[PDB]
Structure formats: C-alpha cells, structure tokens
Amino acid sequence: SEKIRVDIWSDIACPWCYIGKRRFESALGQFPQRDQVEVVWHSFELDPSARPLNPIAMRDGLAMKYSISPAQAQGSLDHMTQTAAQEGLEYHFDRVKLANTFLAHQLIHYAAEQGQGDAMKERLLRAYMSEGQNVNDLDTLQKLAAEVGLDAGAARAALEAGTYAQAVRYDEAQAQQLGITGVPFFVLGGKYGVSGAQAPETLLGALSQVWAEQHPAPLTMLGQDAPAEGC
C-alpha cells in the first residue's frame, strides 16, 4: 500500500523502552520515506500483577527482580541513566514510583483513537522516568491527558469505566502469541521483528529493507501480451 507499518510493543515502566523510542525516532529521521511510515504503539506490562503502587525504591525493586546486590542494582540504574542521557533523556530513578501501568496503557489506547497515541506514550514515559509521577493515579493520568491536548474529562471517564482495558489485554496476548517476551520490540511490515532498544542504524536498515522489498525495480517487458487472466 506504499505504507510501512511499525508496531512497537512497550511498557511505560521500562527504561529501555524510552531509550528505544528515541533510537527509533533517530532512525526515522534518517529515513527518506519517513512520511510513509505508520507507527502504532501496543501495550505490554513487565508485571501485570504489580500492586497499584509499590512504595519501595526503584533500586530495591530491581534488586529483587534480578536477585542482585543493591550496589549492582544501582550500577544498572546508573548505566540506564547514562545511556538515556545520550538520547537527550534525563532520568530520575530516585524519584520513580513503582506503579502498575495497566490504567496508563488504557490512556494510550484512548489517545490513539484521537490520533495522539505517540504523544501520550511520550508524555507517560517522561512522567514515569523523569518526573516521579504515579501513573496509576487517576488525577495524575487525567492531568497528563490534558497536557497532551486531550479531552481531560472524557479521558478520565474512559479510564474510570475501563473502556480500553480489554484492548490492552488483547495487545498483551498478541505479544505472547508472537513470542514477544521482552520490550521494546519492533515489528515492521507485519513481517520482521527487531528485539530490544537497537541502534538507529539497525532500525534504519530495517525500514530501508522493507521499503526496498515493497518497491522492486520495474521489469523490462519482452514480446507482445499473450492470453492471460486477471482479477
């Protein structure tokens, strides 16, 4: 259709996803046919059974998850912080609120129907990673929606009603069916997979490949046209 679809699975709570988003955006900016690219965000939860708000420090949450020392958990946080800084991202992990992200993914689904999925995903990533906001908190979500330019009242109502809950679950089931067990995860043209926060060069190469495959060089035609059948 001369369009390239890029489906990206991601969690708001995953620091590699925000890094991955920037790296993809860098690829996209270098891609000549970038206007033909359609980006769709899909919901993914690192921990769908996470309590509404877990009060512990992100470092301790990480140390528990990966069974490591606090010093090593910190080293890991520091690595992600340094890496993010290279993408123009200023993380503040010391302020992170370890919230269940189900309602936040629902908001992105709401936003997407208004054509603002990416701006909503972006806002929520910054709120979580940099601004110490609780993305499980309805007032907070309502505020973030407003800042994205959405109908704040209607967004809140959609959230309170659970309108997009089942769509989020379907996104997550679709990831499982695809063998997607980690994020960020990129799907291009519904055909190619790219796992993790890959370099811009890798993602640019993927876009180019798919574009090239969907635009073979014209054939040189030989002879007359003989009996054939079309649609």
The order of strands across the largest sheet is 2-1-5-6
Biggest sheet layout = 4 strands, mixed
Question: What is the molecular shape?
Answer: globular
- Kindly identify the CATH topology: Glutaredoxin
For the record, the CATH architecture stands as 3-Layer(aba) Sandwich
Could you spell the SSE succession in H and E letters? Answer: EHEEHHEHHHHHEEH
Task: Give the amount of beta strand, in percent.
Answer: 5-15%
Number of DSSP E strands: 6
| Amount of helix | 40-55%
Q: What is the CATH H-level superfamily? A: Glutaredoxin
Number of domains: 1
Ends: how far apart?
A: 18 Å
CATH structural class: Alpha Beta
Structural class: alpha+beta
**Separate helix tally:** 9
CA gyration radius, whole angstroms: 20 Å
Strand-helix topology:
Layout: E1 4-10, H1 15-30, E2 37-43, E3 53-54, H2 58-65, H3 70-85, E4 98-99, H4 102-113, H5 117-129, H6 138-148, H7 152-161, H8 165-177, E5 185-188, E6 192-195, H9 200-213
Parallel strand pairs: 1-2
Antiparallel strand pairs: 1-5, 3-4, 5-6
Helix pairs in contact: 1-9, 2-3, 4-5, 5-6, 6-7
Could you describe the 3D structure shown?
This is FrnE protein. It comes from Deinococcus radiodurans (strain ATCC 13939 / DSM 20539 / JCM 16871 / CCUG 27074 / LMG 4051 / NBRC 15346 / NCIMB 9279 / VKM B-1422 / R1). The chain has a four-stranded mixed β-sheet. Strands 3-4 form a two-stranded antiparallel sheet. It contains nine helices and six strands; from the N terminus they run βαββααβαααααββα. With 231 residues, it is α+β, with helices and mostly antiparallel strands. The relative contact order is 0.18. Helix 4 packs antiparallel against helix 5. It has a single domain (1-211), classed as Glutaredoxin. It has helices at residues 15-30, 58-65, 70-85, 102-113, 117-129, 138-148, 152-161, 165-177, 200-213, and strands at residues 4-10, 37-43, 53-54, 98-99, 185-188, 192-195. The two termini are 18 Å apart.
